[PDB]
Amino acid sequence: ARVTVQDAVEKIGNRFDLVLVAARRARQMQVGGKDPLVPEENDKTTVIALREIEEGLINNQILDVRERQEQQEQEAAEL
Amino acid sequence: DIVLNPLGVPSRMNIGQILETHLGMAAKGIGDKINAMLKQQQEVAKLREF
Amino acid sequence: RSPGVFFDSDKGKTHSSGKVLYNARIIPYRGSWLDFEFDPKDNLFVRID
Amino acid sequence: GQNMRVAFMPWNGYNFEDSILVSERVVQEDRFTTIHIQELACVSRDTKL
Amino acid sequence: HARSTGSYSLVTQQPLGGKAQFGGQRFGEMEVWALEAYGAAYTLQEMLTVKSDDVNGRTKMYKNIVDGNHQMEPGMPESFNVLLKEIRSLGINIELEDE
Amino acid sequence: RVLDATQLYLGEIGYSPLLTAEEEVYFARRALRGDVASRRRMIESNLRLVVKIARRYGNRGLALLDLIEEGNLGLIRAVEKFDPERGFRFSTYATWWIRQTIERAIMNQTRTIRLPIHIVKELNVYLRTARELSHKLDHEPSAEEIAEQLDKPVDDVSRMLRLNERITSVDTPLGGDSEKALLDILADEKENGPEDTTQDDDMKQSIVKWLFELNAKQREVLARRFGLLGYEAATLEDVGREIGLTRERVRQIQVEGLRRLREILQTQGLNIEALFL
Amino acid sequence: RDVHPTHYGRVCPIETPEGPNIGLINSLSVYAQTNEYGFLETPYRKVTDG
Amino acid sequence: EEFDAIKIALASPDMIRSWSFGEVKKPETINYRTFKPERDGLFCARIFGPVKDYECLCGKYKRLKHRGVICEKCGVEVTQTKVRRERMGHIELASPTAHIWFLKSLPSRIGLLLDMPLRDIERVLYFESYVVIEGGMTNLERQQILTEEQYLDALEEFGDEFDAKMGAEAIQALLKSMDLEQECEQLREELNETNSETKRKKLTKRIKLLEAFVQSGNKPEWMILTVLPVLPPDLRPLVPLDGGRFATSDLNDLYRRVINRNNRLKRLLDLAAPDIIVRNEKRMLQEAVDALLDNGRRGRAITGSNKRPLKSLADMIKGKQGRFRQNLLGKRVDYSGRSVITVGPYLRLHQCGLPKKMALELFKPFIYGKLELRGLATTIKAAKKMVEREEAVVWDILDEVIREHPVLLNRAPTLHRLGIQAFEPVLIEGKAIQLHPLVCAAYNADFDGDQMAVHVPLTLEAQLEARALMMSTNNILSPANGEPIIVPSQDVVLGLYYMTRDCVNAKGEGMVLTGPKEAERLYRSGLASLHARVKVRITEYEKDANGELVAKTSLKDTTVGRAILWMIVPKGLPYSIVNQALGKKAISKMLNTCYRILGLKPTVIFADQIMYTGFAYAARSGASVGIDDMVIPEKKHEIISEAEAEVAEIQEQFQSGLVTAGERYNKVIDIWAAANDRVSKAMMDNLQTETVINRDGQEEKQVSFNSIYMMADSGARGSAAQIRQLAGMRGLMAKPDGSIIETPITANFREGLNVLQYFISTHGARKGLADTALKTANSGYLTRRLVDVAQDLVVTEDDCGTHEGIMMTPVIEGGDVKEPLRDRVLGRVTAEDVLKPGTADILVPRNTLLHEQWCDLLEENSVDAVKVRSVVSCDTDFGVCAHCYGRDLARGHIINKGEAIGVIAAQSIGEPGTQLTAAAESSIQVKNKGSIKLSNVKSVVNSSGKLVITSRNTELKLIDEFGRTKESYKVPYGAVLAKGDGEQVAGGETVANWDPHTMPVITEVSGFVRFTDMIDGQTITRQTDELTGLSSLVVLDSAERTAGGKDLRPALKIVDAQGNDVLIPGTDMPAQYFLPGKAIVQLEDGVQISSGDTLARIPQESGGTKDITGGLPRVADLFEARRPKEPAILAEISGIVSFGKETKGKRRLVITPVDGSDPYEEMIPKWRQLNVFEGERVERGDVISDGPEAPHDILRLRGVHAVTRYIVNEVQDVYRLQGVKINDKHIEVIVRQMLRKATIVNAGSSDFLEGEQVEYSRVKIANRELEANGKVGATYSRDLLGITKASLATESFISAASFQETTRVLTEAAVAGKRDELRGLKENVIVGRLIPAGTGYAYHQDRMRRRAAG
DNA sequence: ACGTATGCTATAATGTGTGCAGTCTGACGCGG
Ligand SMILES: [Mg+2]
Ligand SMILES: [Zn+2]
Structure with a gap:
């Protein structure tokens, strides 16, 4: 997680799409103030986002479902 | 005083530094003997011969 | 370069011919340059400056 | 410069690529401590104002 | 030497040079190709814009870092906006054709 | 053949009339009365004279091709106003014109920072006085040493020497070695870097919260006066235009806002800490 | 730049910057x-x- | 602000007026005291805008209360100073002026369009001769120049009916009248008649210019400027110094030249002055305009104050010092610091020492941020002072943000990607950076005073990128070669070497231990040496069929040191690996083994632990450099003294007059050369096994513990080559000319050089260090050249869907296999179902990655040749597939799509050359028994009874029992074979023998020698001796030859006893061997010869160490595709050879193919010898002539996979000579890019037509729609392009101008009106956008679907 | 009134030149 990022690349595949998924999640915790899934243990957003991907909690499909699940709650509610 | 790397020598081929070291030590060896006789407060004739 | 005269030759200006073309050059302390040079047909030329 | 007792041998890689390992005793004698006289100036100018 | 943000150049609008004038290290094209090879695209775009010219970017990014939100906010380096007008001053129609 | 703009013109003047005393008068008499062809000739003829006059006025400011053009304009004004009836030659009269028109055009296009003739004319006498002094003092004269020989003001001499101060181009190399010019050193005045931009942005945002955190009638006659929230920076008496319409009560409320704000700076940890600044 | 056998006794073979101004500059x-x-x-x- | 493209078109006088906000009519910069703009001057605020943010000049409207208010008095708007660099100006030119970029920038452009030369146009401009615009009376036709005499003749005679004028006015009217519609049709008609090469070329280029000009919408009149734009004043600054001085750009000065002359012309047109003066004014005006656009071009550049030339406009867009390379692609960058680096032997691999006061300033905005969060700062200037005071609690906050934050460390120069690596900063008190020893290799960072730039990744994406891609742990192997660059050196290797290395008995020999822990126990207890042979119990782990790891306990007989090293060794690798004495070369395999087996984590740990124990035990050893360590062999004075008398013997023979000076010169070098190798080997024989004095019972023989040897043997520093100079003999030095001194240096560095020995050492020393500085620029420039062409290559598709590939064959040459089918085909996707010998079961599938384990089964089955899916065989338009490339050698598995290869490839090739700056092959001895197998050989038996070879490229194989190639040699021309073709030889037998310092010309027929065209003085010379008088003849070449005998070819003609010619067996060729230049001949005219006798000996001087200085220009020339000066001829199409007609020896060839009825003729020189001898079954691209192959000749005939196989072999040959390791796929990248454009042959559905040369991807996309729709196919023929040219060819003009030729690129792009839609990296790095590759690949393609969705 | 700008003088004079000249390999573009 801090030294290694191979265990994180194992899960997604593309070294590039890993940084994009990890950044988007890092930004949700950095701005939205979302909760970390893994014990944070005094690590910055950088590391925590990798930990969730490394263990397998964060994915391209996972985050897109969860986005529109918060946004569809808003749709039904407004009108 | 200083600890230098011996590997900065073969590749470099500047053996003059090692000779500088050896002679410097010899030179100091002589100063160390003269230092000892001057501390011991010996004699003018003893220093003269050496 | 010391003033006076100097003989040189581009050992093959045209490696086409590969001919060692010999040239001379008068180098003054002040003044214009005076060069003499051959050519593929060994015609003597002069090129001031 | 200054002469000193030197010893040629590696030391836990603190003399890796020609890197130097100097005693605190050299620093205590302040023998390789250097002097640097720096000159700074203050200019009183005549501006448009 | 060390620098976070300081002086800026007169036209290029990128930082000055050297600890003499308190200027950032130059990241030349060779230094650039290295990041292109890695794939690190933001790290480069970050060093082309917010860290150098992008007048909007540099100040905007500063404010975002102190906020904690280390967020990419590019615009387009001045040194290029210069190159446009410089080619127009040479009597060549160089406009930015849109989408 | 010939592809130098210099030699081409210098060719065309080399094939132009070279006028005699009575020839000059014949053409000139008709030139004043407008013969058209006559004004063209006298001019065409004496272009050769302009070149010899620009040969002495060269290597000082502009190029030889720039002196000839403006030297030709002097010969033309000399032709617009010559007296053929007078027994005196033309070459004599035209020289006074060609020497003048050149000097004048050099005084304008020589300096980047445009210097009118008044400041310049005088500068020359200050400089030409420095010559005299330099030769006999064997020491380049000071601003004082020039002032003591002319018996003129000290600041005048000095301020005239300030306008003589010449320029270095921004694109000039440094150390006689193409490595970096002055633009790759010289800082930008106008824009201060993010740290100074965010200073004012953060300092002003805190002020907006301070006004909302203070009394509503205390930040209504304070920010509207200094021009902090309002649109124009008014004075104690001018805050009466808004709703206050008072002079005494505006001054008591302004200072009441500042007194409560001075305690807000002593408690946050500034007061004497932010007084140095 | 190359050392020329004329240098013998006149110019030093080992005294010159190792920079692009290498062979031109030389101590006496x-x-x-x-x-x-x-x-x-x-x-x-x-x-x-x- | 977000766009799609950038366009370049010609600036119309009307267009220039659109940008301009006013007309500068005065040269006045500012007033002298009031430092403010002048009235419609060059810094005018009425034209370029206000000074300060929202302030007019006189001061009437101030700040935003008067948003956009225009002042009355001064007439100045109240907007931001923003507009002072945005707003432009213009100047209304009295008379029209020509653009230098559309006149001097070749092609002429203005002249190319008019069908008019340069001289003609210029003499019109400078008013030397008039030019006809249109003659009503057909007497005078258009574009006919008339001298000042000839204008007057037509005036009174014809006149009026003819319109002709002079100056830039004329040529504009000529451009304004010429019709692009009609003169396009006219040229097309003339093309149908009888078309040549030059005629059609000229026509087609003009044709396309004319059509391009009409479709670009540009008008040829805009070539002449009626309006001249002015640059914004802020972009040509007049700013004041702190010293009361001012400074101005040279543009302002150049502008004042233009405006002054233009206004003086207005004045002279008011006066109606005579034309002679008006002419000068117009010439001047042009001189000023041309000097403003591009100063140094037309004539002398206008020099200014400091006698230097004024910097013009073009100059700020031109080359290195232009905006592109200096102020756009290259930038100084914030959050950056540099400092002296020093060692960090305590750090782990993922760590680096960062000074506190450095990281303090670097992370300034991150302190202010975390400070407001804690509530310690209320505002930011409060946080600023907190930091300034350096109070205690601020260090702890700085320390907080830095944790879990990577920093980039760069070292100059940045060769390859590894020139930057990311680490986790460790704050250290001290102004020195501390760097990890193992990654020192990647930077080439020597702690001798190096500095490294630091950079802080700001954005979270940059923190992830730095940790993911640029972290030191994620970067192990080189991308160039699948080999670890993270490998110990220096102390570390020596320490492990000391440990593992063994010695006789010592303390506690043959003892018996529980484990490697008891070995540490006994050594540190002082009751065993690290060099004691011992039995120990170890449990080595070996992996199972699955992931499961099996444990196996075993007794090992190893040393105490080896046992202790096992402790560092992870459990999964065998123990046999540390059972040997470990060296640098052995250690590099340990980490690679560890990597390919366990993975990444285990290696990083292992790597560090190896380093730690290496340093520690190296320091425990106390390895030193005494002067008794420099042991000279026993008998040096015995070798030299008698090797001197050897040379003294020949010296006395020379003055007698037998052995010539040249033979003595070569003969004395051989004596000294033997003595030098004699002293070298006696030294190491007395130094390697110096330890012959042991114990146990009496004696034993053992490796020497001489300090210097250990340090060389281990592979730590220096080698056998260096020790020679130390203890042996210095060796033979080289003169600055290139010739080698007859007398070498006898002494060594221990003994001391005399005064000359040093003087001699200088010559070689200075020239070696001169080529370190000067030759680096050619190699560093190659890196630049390679990159630009390989910028665009990125992995785009996953599978290109192609079943093509280049067939790679095992590289064997020199006897030892240079690159086996394993190394050469590793990580290459098989493009063809390649099984085992027995073709009855499939061994390997199609689309599959060749891993090292899979490559091990290639060895069991012994693969012959493999068709690898290559880059060039890729069908992916705009990039390549992950299959075509294969594995990312840096990573260790299949490449990611989006990774930008082209740049990785270029870096890999240029990196070694840039950092990288005894030929007595008398006889081949075969080593294993085999049958002799020659190929491409045509030999003939001689008088002696020996098989002499009369063919240039003869190869010698060594066939084993089953029938496969083991060893391979190059047998040269005129070599004597021991046994001919098919004969058995034994091991250690000289199968071939020849003289190296000579190239013989050997005959094929017997009889007498005839002299033809060998006239004395013209072609050859003559020199005789004494008493008898043996004379030698020396053939002069075109260099030493007069103009008399230039077309005479000198040759030794063979004849019989009668005097007639002797036919060469089975050919109608009378025997005639052409002798080349400087050919020494011993047989004179009228000498009897047998077949196999040497006619002449051509000297083969090659005493220049090629190294890397004199072999990179060969690489360059290959890449740049520069045909050699003696190209080899190849057959075009297959069929029947039929020799044709001849021209004074110049041979033709009337080839008449079997299917093809129409003959094909091509010409051949006389002196050049062919390979085929006429009337033959030749195929496509058989080797006809011998010599260097032209790269264009290869692709033209033998297709893509032939030219790719050539460049790859040819390039690698030069790098393999230097021991540079590069995968062939990296060269193949550049090769692919060199095959970008292609000439079209055949009319298509699109208006392609002939003579057009379009990119290969675009024409193939048209072929996609054609096979679907039918219509007319667009047949093609791929062309090869040099690097410098391939860069300027890309449709991206931005990428082309950013490279070089920037003056030309822009002008060609302006006339075409081309719009760049940005694909390349250079293109988007300039604009400062997301790179359409790597990290940005995922984003850029998500914008491409915005375009696709409607 | 103050600052800047425009204006004229009358021995005769009538065609400039100036300034570094061991770069070099490689590539075209106009005549001849
Ligand atoms: Mg170094
Ligand atoms: Zn105003």
Whole structure:
């Protein structure tokens, strides 16, 4: 997680799409103030986002479902 | 005083530094003997011969 | 370069011919340059400056 | 410069690529401590104002 | 030497040079190709814009870092906006054709 | 053949009339009365004279091709106003014109920072006085040493020497070695870097919260006066235009806002800490 | 730039920046001196009849 | 602000007026005291805008209360100073002026369009001769120049009916009248008649210019400027110094030249002055305009104050010092610091020492941020002072943000990607950076005073990128070669070497231990040496069929040191690996083994632990450099003294007059050369096994513990080559000319050099260090050249869907296999179902990655040749597939799509050359028994009874029992074979023998020698000796030859006893061997010869160490595709050879193919010898002539996979000579890019037509729609392009101008009106956008679907 | 009134030149 990022690349595949998924999640915790899934243990957003991907909690499909699940709650509610 | 790397020598081929070291030590060896006789407060004739 | 005269030759200006073309050059302390040079047909030329 | 007792041998890689390992005793004698006289100036100018 | 943000150049609008004038290290094209090879695209775009010219970017990014939100906010380096007008001053129609 | 703009013109003047005393008068008499062809000739003829006059006025400011053009304009004004009836030659009269028109055009296009003739004319006498002094003092004269020989003001001499101060181009190399010019050193005045931009942005945002955190009638006659929230920076008496319409009560409320704000700076940890600044 | 056998006694073979201004810049030899005309000259012990 | 493209078109006088906000009519910069703009001057605020943010000049409207208010008095708007660099100006030119970029920038452009030369146009401009615009009376036709005499003749005679004028006015009217519609049709008609090469070329280029000009919408009149734009004043600054001085750009000065002359012309047109003066004014005006656009071009550049030339406009867009390379692609960058680096032997691999006061300033905005969060700062200037005071609690906050934050460390120069690596900063008190020893290799960072730039990744994406891609742990192997660059050196290797290395008995020999822990126990207890042979119990782990790891306990007989090293060794690798004495070369395999087996984590740990124990035990050893360590062999004075008398013997023979000076010169070098190798080997024989004095019972023989040897043997520093100079003999030095001194240096560095020995050492020393500085620029420039062409290559598709590939064959040459089918085909996707010998079961599938384990089964089955899916065989338009490339050698598995290869490839090739700056092959001895197998050989038996070879490229194989190639040699021309073709030889037998310092010309027929065209003085010379008088003849070449005998070819003609010619067996060729230049001949005219006798000996001087200085220009020339000066001829199409007609020896060839009825003729020189001898079954691209192959000749005939196989072999040959390791796929990248454009042959559905040369991807996309729709196919023929040219060819003009030729690129792009839609990296790095590759690949393609969705 | 700008003088004079000249390999573009 801090030294290694191979265990994180194992899960997604593309070294590039890993940084994009990890950044988007890092930004949700950095701005939205979302909760970390893994014990944070005094690590910055950088590391925590990798930990969730490394263990397998964060994915391209996972985050897109969860986005529109918060946004569809808003749709039904407004009108 | 200083600890230098011996590997900065073969590749470099500047053996003059090692000779500088050896002679410097010899030179100091002589100063160390003269230092000892001057501390011991010996004699003018003893220093003269050496 | 010391003033006076100097003989040189581009050992093959045209490696086409590969001919060692010999040239001379008068180098003054002040003044214009005076060069003499051959050519593929060994015609003597002069090129001031 | 200054002469000193030197010893040629590696030391836990603190003399890796020609890197130097100097005693605190050299620093205590302040023998390789250097002097640097720096000159700074203050200019009183005549501006448009 | 060390620098976070300081002086800026007169036209290029990128930082000055050297600890003499308190200027950032130059990241030349060779230094650039290295990041292109890695794939690190933001790290480069970050060093082309917010860290150098992008007048909007540099100040905007500063404010975002102190906020904690280390967020990419590019615009387009001045040194290029210069190159446009410089080619127009040479009597060549160089406009930015849109989408 | 010939592809130098210099030699081409210098060719065309080399094939132009070279006028005699009575020839000059014949053409000139008709030139004043407008013969058209006559004004063209006298001019065409004496272009050769302009070149010899620009040969002495060269290597000082502009190029030889720039002196000839403006030297030709002097010969033309000399032709617009010559007296053929007078027994005196033309070459004599035209020289006074060609020497003048050149000097004048050099005084304008020589300096980047445009210097009118008044400041310049005088500068020359200050400089030409420095010559005299330099030769006999064997020491380049000071601003004082020039002032003591002319018996003129000290600041005048000095301020005239300030306008003589010449320029270095921004694109000039440094150390006689193409490595970096002055633009790759010289800082930008106008824009201060993010740290100074965010200073004012953060300092002003805190002020907006301070006004909302203070009394509503205390930040209504304070920010509207200094021009902090309002649109124009008014004075104690001018805050009466808004709703206050008072002079005494505006001054008591302004200072009441500042007194409560001075305690807000002593408690946050500034007061004497932010007084140095 | 290359060292020329004329340098012997006149110019030093090992004294020059290792930068692009390498072979052009050069220090003068110890006992080297200028010829009255301009060239360089070096001291030499004359051998008379052996 | 977000766009799609950038366009370049010609600036119309009307267009220039659109940008301009006013007309500068005065040269006045500012007033002298009031430092403010002048009235419609060059810094005018009425034209370029206000000074300060929202302030007019006189001061009437101030700040935003008067948003956009225009002042009355001064007439100045109240907007931001923003507009002072945005707003432009213009100047209304009295008379029209020509653009230098559309006149001097070749092609002429203005002249190319008019069908008019340069001289003609210029003499019109400078008013030397008039030019006809249109003659009503057909007497005078258009574009006919008339001298000042000839204008007057037509005036009174014809006149009026003819319109002709002079100056830039004329040529504009000529451009304004010429019709692009009609003169396009006219040229097309003339093309149908009888078309040549030059005629059609000229026509087609003009044709396309004319059509391009009409479709670009540009008008040829805009070539002449009626309006001249002015640059914004802020972009040509007049700013004041702190010293009361001012400074101005040279543009302002150049502008004042233009405006002054233009206004003086207005004045002279008011006066109606005579034309002679008006002419000068117009010439001047042009001189000023041309000097403003591009100063140094037309004539002398206008020099200014400091006698230097004024910097013009073009100059700020031109080359290195232009905006592109200096102020756009290259930038100084914030959050950056540099400092002296020093060692960090305590750090782990993922760590680096960062000074506190450095990281303090670097992370300034991150302190202010975390400070407001804690509530310690209320505002930011409060946080600023907190930091300034350096109070205690601020260090702890700085320390907080830095944790879990990577920093980039760069070292100059940045060769390859690894020139930057990311680490986790460790704050250290001290102004020195501390760097990890193992990654020192990647930077080439020597702690001798190096500095490294630091950079802080700001954005979270940059923190992830730095940790993911640029972290030191994620970067192990080189991308160039699948080999670890993270490998110990220096102390570390020596320490492990000391440990593992063994010695006789010592303390506690043959003892018996529980484990490697008891070995540490006994050594540190002082009751065993690290060099004691011992039995120990170890449990080595070996992996199972699955992931499961099996444990196996075993007794090992190893040393105490080896046992202790096992402790560092992870459990999964065998123990046999540390059972040997470990060296640098052995250690590099340990980490690679560890990597390919366990993975990444285990290696990083292992790597560090190896380093730690290496340093520690190296320091425990106390390895030193005494002067008794420099052991000279026993008998040096014995070798030299008698090797001197050897040379003294020949010296006395020379003055007698037998052995010539040249033969003595070569003969004395051989004596000294033997003595030098004699002293070298006696030294190491007395130094390697110096330890012959042991114990146990009496004696034993053992490796020497001489300090210097250990340090060389281990592979730590220096080698056998260096020790030679130390203890042996210095060796033979080289003169600055290139010739080698007859007398070498006898002494060594221990003994001391005499005064000359040093003087001699200088010559070689200075020239070696001169080529370190100067030759680096050619190699560093190659890196630049390679990159630009390989910028665009990125992995785009996953599978290109192609079943093509280049067939790679095992590289064997020199006897030892240079690159086996394993190394050469590793990580290459098989493009063809390649099984085992027995073709009855499939061994390997199609689309599959060749891993090292899979490559091990290639060895069991012994693969012959493999068709690898290559880059060039890729069908992916705009990039390549992950299959075509294969594995990312840096990573260790299949490449990611989006990774930008082209740049990785270029870096890999240029990196070694840039950092990288005894030929007595008398006889081949075969080593294993085999049958002799020659190929491409045509030999003939001689008088002696020996098989002499009369063919240039003869190869010698060594066939084993089953029938496969083991060893391979190059047998040269005129070599004597021991046994001919098919004969058995034994091991250690000289199968071939020849003289190396000579190239013989050997005959094929017997009889007498005739002299033809060998006239004395013209072609050859003559020199005789004494008493008898043996004379030698020396053939002069065109260099030493007069103009008399230039077309005479000198040759030794063979004849019989009668005097007639002797036919060469089975050909109608009379025997005639052409002798080349400097050919020494010993037989004179009228000498009897047998077949196999040497006619002449051509000297083969090659005493120049090629190294890397004199072999990179060969690489360059290959890449740049520069045909050699003696190209080899190849057959075009297959069929029947039929020899044709001849021209004074110049041979033709009337080839008449079997299917093809129409003959094909091509010409051949006389002196050049062919390979085929006429009337033959030749195929496509058989080797006809011998010599260097032209790269264009290869692709033209033998297709893509032939030219790719050539460049790859040819390039690698030069790098393999230097021991540079590069995968062939990296060269193949550049090769692919060199095959970008292609000439079209055949009319298509699109208006392609002939003579057009379009990119290969675009024409193939048209072929996609054609096979679907039918219509007319667009047949093609791929062309090869040099690097410098391939860069300027890309449709991206931005990428082309950013490279070089920037003056030309822009002008060609302006006339075409081309719009760049940005694909390349250079293109988007300039604009400062997301790179359409790597990290940005995922984003850029998500914008491409915005375009696709409607 | 103050600052800047425009204006004229009358021995005769009538065609400039100036300034570094061991770069070099490689590539075209106009005549001849
Ligand atoms: Mg270094
Ligand atoms: Zn105003």
